[PDB]
Amino acid sequence: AQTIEATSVKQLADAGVRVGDTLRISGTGMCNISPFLPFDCSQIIWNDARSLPLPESELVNKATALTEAVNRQLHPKPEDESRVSASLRSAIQKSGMVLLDDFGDIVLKTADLCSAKDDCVRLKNALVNLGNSKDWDALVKRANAGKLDGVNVLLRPVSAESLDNLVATSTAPFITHETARAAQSLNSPAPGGFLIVSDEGSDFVDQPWPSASLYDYPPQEQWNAFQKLAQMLMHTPFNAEGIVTKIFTDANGTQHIGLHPIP
Amino acid sequence: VRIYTNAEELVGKPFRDLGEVSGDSCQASNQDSPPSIPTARKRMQINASKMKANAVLLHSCEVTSGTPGCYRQAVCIGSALNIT
Numbered sequence: 001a002q003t004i005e006a007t008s009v010k011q012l013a014d015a016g017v018r019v020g021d022t023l024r025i026s027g028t029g030m031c032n033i034s035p036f037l038p039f040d041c042s043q044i045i046w047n048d049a050r051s052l053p054l055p056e057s058e059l060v061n062k063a064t065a066l067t068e069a070v071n072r073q074l075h076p077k078p079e080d081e082s083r084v085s086a087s088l089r090s091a092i093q094k095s096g097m098v099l100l101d102d103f104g105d106i107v108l109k110t111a112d113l114c115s116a117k118d119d120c121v122r123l124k125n126a127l128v129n130l131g132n133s134k135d136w137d138a139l140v141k142r143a144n145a146g147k148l149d150g151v152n153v154l155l156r157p158v159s160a161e162s163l164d165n166l167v168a169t170s171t172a173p174f175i176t177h178e179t180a181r182a183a184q185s186l187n188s189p190a191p192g193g194f195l196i197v198s199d200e201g202s203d204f205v206d207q208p209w210p211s212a213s214l215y216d217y218p219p220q221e222q223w224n225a226f227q228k229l230a231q232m233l234m235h236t237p238f239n240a241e242g243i244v245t246k247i248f249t250d251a252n253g254t255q256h257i258g259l260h261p262i263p
Numbered sequence: 264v265r266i267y268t269n270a271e272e273l274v275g276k277p278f279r280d281l282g283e284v285s286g287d288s289c290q291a292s293n294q295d296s297p298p299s300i301p302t303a304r305k306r307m308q309i310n311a312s313k314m315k316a317n318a319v320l321l322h323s324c325e326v327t328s329g330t331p332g333c334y335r336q337a338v339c340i341g342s343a344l345n346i347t
Contacts, residue, residue, distance in 0.1 A: 084280045085280050085282050085283060085342065087282070087283040087322070087340075087342060088280050088283075088320070088342040091270075091320070091322050091341075091342060092270065095270045097270045097271070103277060129275075130275065130277070131277060132277055132347060148277075150279065151277045151278070151279055151347060152277070152278055152279065152280060153275075153276075153277050153278075154270055154273045154274050154275075154276070154278075155274055155275070156271070156274055
């Protein structure tokens with residue numbers, strides 16, 4: 001029985017690990033897909049071909065962009081740009097009513113997220129009713145023609161809250177479905193390399209635990225927390241030490257190594 | 264150039280904003296005929312057409328005093344609008 005120390009995947013592959021050996025490994029890897037859930041940091045994917053990219057989603061970005069474009073008109077931030085004159089702006093706040101800065105922006109960002117015929121039909125109907133176009137496709141044509149850029153629309157708060165809520169309920173399912181796809185995507189490991197497994201289920205990383213479980217967050221906040229977790233745990237330093245209790249190659253050429261902790 | 268007095272009257276009318284406009288009517292001396300708010304309105308709307316306006320949302324026409332050059336002054340302003 002040997003004592004093997006390895007600081008790279010290639011070193012371990014050439015070491016000829018056997019059951020009974022003592023193994024000491026340090027490097028950077030990915031937690032397999034506990035406060036880190038959906039990750040398991042007691043099992044480290046250690047491979048030279050880290051082909052899995054961090055979870056990114058054009059569809060989520062389109063949803064976030066739509067939500068942002070509407071919120072800057074219904075809930076402006078300190079720095080936020082106002083796209084009407086100061087005087088008309090000034091006049092609307094003392095008025096006590098709600099203005100859309102930029103109707104064309106909302107149409108185009110909706111058309112972008114909701115590109116399918118069947119997506120977001122209620123939101124599309126709400127936008128058609130605010131504009132002067134016949135149907136949604138006629139409105140999108142004028143939007144793509146540029147006829148709506150910086151056009152303003154005035155609506156009363158009941159319609160503005162119906163609109164804010166329509167957008168909230170149209171964007172959110174895209175983000176929920178994309179977080180399902182993304183975590184399921186991460187479940188397909190690259191061929192070869194190693195899977196280093198704690199028999200006790202102890203973590204091989206020293207990473208800060210999330211302050212709460214992202215599964216309890218609403219969709220956008222959940223996606224953001226998951227992107228942060230993945231950014232940490234898909235490229236994490238790890239230290240794995242113990243007695244080898246099993247080693248075998250799976251159908252994907254990945255070598256699974258079970259380690260038992262040393263007292 | 265149509266004149267709207269409440270924002271509520273433009274609800275459901277896409278429009279472009281073209282900036283502030285005003286009309287005025289002075290009365291030089293306390294002796295002279297009082298300031299005419301109507302004459303201010305009409306100057307406002309004709310200057311609205313100068314900016315290629317379609318309508319005006321009226322902010323205010325308070326009749327002020329401290330204005331220099333006339334005893335009391337009728338200032339009357341609003342936003343020039345282009346209804347699509």
